[PDB]
């Protein structure tokens, strides 16, 4: 983990969250539950969709090999032809594999980035009103009803809510 969120301070993944890539898990008075953060899940699906399509669009005009033949006294240009077509098909094989290796990584570190940016979305809201457990969870200094969870889940949480 480059940002350290995924498989770092958060030990693993939540099987129960079949609603998206990033989300939450609360447990207040009115029960537990899961909710997919449709916000960051969208700026992520937008990411890889454009990424896949860009990798494909960057290589639609690549290199086509055409068939040419040569007689017994044209061994030089035949070899030139052979190595020149093998040449381009090698570099494009390199270009494809290398772009995949490089963008698979920037893909994983992108999900790590989003989690790190969601834990910080909540952390930069519940300043004193909670304690950072450090395993990925927070614990409130007040009770948080099912309408309190929603205000955090959409960006505007009210600070006026006492302490200890």
């Amino acid at each position: 983990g480059l940002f350290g969120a995924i498989a770092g301070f958060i030990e693993g993944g939540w099987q129960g969250m079949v609603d998206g890539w990033y989300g939450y898990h609360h447990s207040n008075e009115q029960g537990s539950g899961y909710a997919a953060d449709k916000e960051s899940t969208q700026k992520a699906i937008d990411g890889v969709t454009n990424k896949v399509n860009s990798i494909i669009d960057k290589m639609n005009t690549q290199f086509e090999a055409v068939g040419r033949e040569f007689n017994n006294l044209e061994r030089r240009i035949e070899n030139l032809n052979k190595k020149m077509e093998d040449g381009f098909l090698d570099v494009w094989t390199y270009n494809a594999e290398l772009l995949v290796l490089m963008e698979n990584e920037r893909t994983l570190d992108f999900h790590d980035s989003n989690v790190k940016n969601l834990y910080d979305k909540v952390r930069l809201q519940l300043r004193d009103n909670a304690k950072e457990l450090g395993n990925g969870c927070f614990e409130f200094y007040h009770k948080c009803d099912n309408e309190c969870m929603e205000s955090i889940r959409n960006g505007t949480y009210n600070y006026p809510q006492y302490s200890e």
């Binding site: 993944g13 040419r68 494809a96 409130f140 009770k143």
Partner: protein
């Protein structure tokens, strides 16, 4: 008491991808961008059927090797399939000038229309139906290439030939002819009376003089003699002029180029499957939405991009414990 927790997706997929710093990494979701399967067949290309030379070569087809009658008339094709070592080629031993350059032209053509430009019956002062050989048998009898006629003397005489044909079509004409190289001076006179002969050929552009080479050579297909073939593209309204006093292998049929286009000459032992496709390789056709493939570099049609890899998987999802 009360809690709130931030986490991420996970599931049951075992699919792995690679990165620069780490191989074999399992993820939630992925996308394979590499098509690795074909149908192992030679298909039509968007409904237009390929021309599958079977045990005939391009030369055997174009010259009309008697063992190649299957291709006497040939409809529009999409691509041409030739075997690595066609057994029916130059039945009469010899050579074919600028053959690979002709083969290349063919990959730029989609349809020929055979037409008779000099009928075999028009030869009044030479023999035209005795130009046969055991080297080129048809159903057990001595024959010859169908599109050209091997003229010999008549009543112990070979008057010098002056034959001319004007391309009055709107299409380019592929015109083939040849010269015969005997094995000794006896054979020369036996076939042509005249001891010292030539064949001149002219167009707007072409200006050649051929003289036969009477010489001792090693037997091939039973013969020491040779037949050597030439060709040219006759442009509309241009004419071709032949003059010869022996050894002339005159044209009879030629090919109107009625459809230029994108094409190919595939080397494949495969034969006609009964199918249709958008992408054809020499080892089988492809039907895919993949952006890449690894089946064969020489390809024709709207195809994925060829790549030497055996696996190419893009990571869409995230890490999975």
């Amino acid at each position: 008491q009360d809690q709130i927790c931030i986490g991420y997706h996970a599931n049951n997929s075992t699919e792995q991808v690679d990165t620069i710093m780490e191989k074999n990494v399992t993820v939630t979701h992925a996308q394979d961008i590499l098509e690795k399967t074909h149908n192992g067949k030679l298909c039509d290309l968007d409904g237009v059927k390929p021309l599958i030379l079977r045990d005939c070569s391009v030369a055997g087809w174009l010259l009309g090797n008697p063992m190649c009658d299957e291709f006497i008339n040939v409809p529009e094709w999409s691509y041409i399939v030739e075997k690595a070592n066609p057994t029916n080629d130059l039945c009469y031993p010899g050579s074919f000038n600028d053959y690979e350059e002709l083969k290349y032209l063919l990959s730029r053509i989609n349809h020929f229309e055979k037409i008779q430009i000099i009928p075999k019956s028009s030869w009044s002062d030479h023999e035209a139906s005795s130009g046969v050989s055991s080297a080129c048998p048809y159903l057990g009898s001595p024959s010859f290439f169908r599109n050209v006629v091997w003229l010999i003397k008549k009543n112990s005489a070979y008057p010098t030939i002056k034959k001319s044909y004007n391309n009055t079509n709107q299409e380019d004409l592929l015109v083939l002819w040849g010269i015969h190289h005997p094995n000794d001076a006896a054979e020369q006179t036996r076939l042509y009376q005249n001891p010292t002969t030539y064949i001149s050929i002219g167009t707007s552009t072409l200006n050649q003089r051929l003289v036969p080479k009477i010489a001792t050579r090693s037997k091939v297909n039973g013969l020491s003699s040779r037949m050597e073939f030439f060709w040219t593209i006759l442009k509309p309204n241009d004419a071709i002029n032949f003059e010869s006093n022996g050894n002339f292998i005159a044209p009879e049929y030629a090919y109107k180029i009625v459809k230029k286009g994108d094409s190919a000459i595939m080397k494949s032992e495969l034969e006609y499957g009964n199918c249709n496709t958008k992408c054809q390789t020499p080892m089988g056709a492809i039907n895919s939405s993949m952006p890449f493939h690894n089946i064969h570099p020489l390809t024709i049609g709207e195809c994925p991009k060829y790549v030497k890899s055996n696996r190419l998987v893009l990571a869409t999802g995230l890490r999975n414990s």
